[PDB]
Subunit: 52 residues, 5 copies
């Protein structure tokens, strides 16, 4: 129980996410669009591999 509580606290303690302050929504856009494009890039590679 206390171990779980500490584990949860430890997990949160371990967890950390940081982005630009002024350019926050810019960073969020980098985080979103690149992730999508990167997924597509990787997908196209699979399309290319299959096609090959």
């Amino acid at each position: 129980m206390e171990k779980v509580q500490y584990l949860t606290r430890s997990a949160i303690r371990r967890a950390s996410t940081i982005e630009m302050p002024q350019q926050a929504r810019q960073n969020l856009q980098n985080l979103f669009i690149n992730f999508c494009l990167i997924l597509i890039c990787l997908l196209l590679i699979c399309i290319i591999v299959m096609l090959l």
Copy 2:
């Protein structure tokens, strides 16, 4: 009638959309471009499934 009016008010009351103030059009861009990229990603998956 009054029920409909209240329902409309309740619907509006329930409705809520929020984005970054300074980075508003950035957030709108995140909202627009990611949605379109995400659609392409999903549509590439359809192509991939159909290819497979």
Copy 3:
């Protein structure tokens, strides 16, 4: 002639385009990239239909 002049003025009067001031080039980017994506999204659908 005067009718054409008024028509031109009327057309200009009817014409109106507005975007965010501070986030102008952001809005222009939304206007440009989404249009390109959205076109491709629609063009992927054409490929999907043709694939189907």
Copy 4:
């Protein structure tokens, strides 16, 4: 020689590129990303023509 020098000066004089000041890297992003998207759109049309 002097003609070439003047021609170089004239070429530079003719040459002119302008983008938003505050939204410079935004404009550069519009310039880069849209160009690449536009290329993909055109290249999808080539795929579509070839699909048909």
Copy 5:
């Protein structure tokens, strides 16, 4: 050893990366998104070449 240390220092000395200050995360987005799109464009060309 000292040569390696100097080489490391020289490598760092040679190494240099610069982007817009205010439009930093914008520049990082240009750096990320264009790189992905450019890769996709190049990968579409591969698809086009194969298809042809």
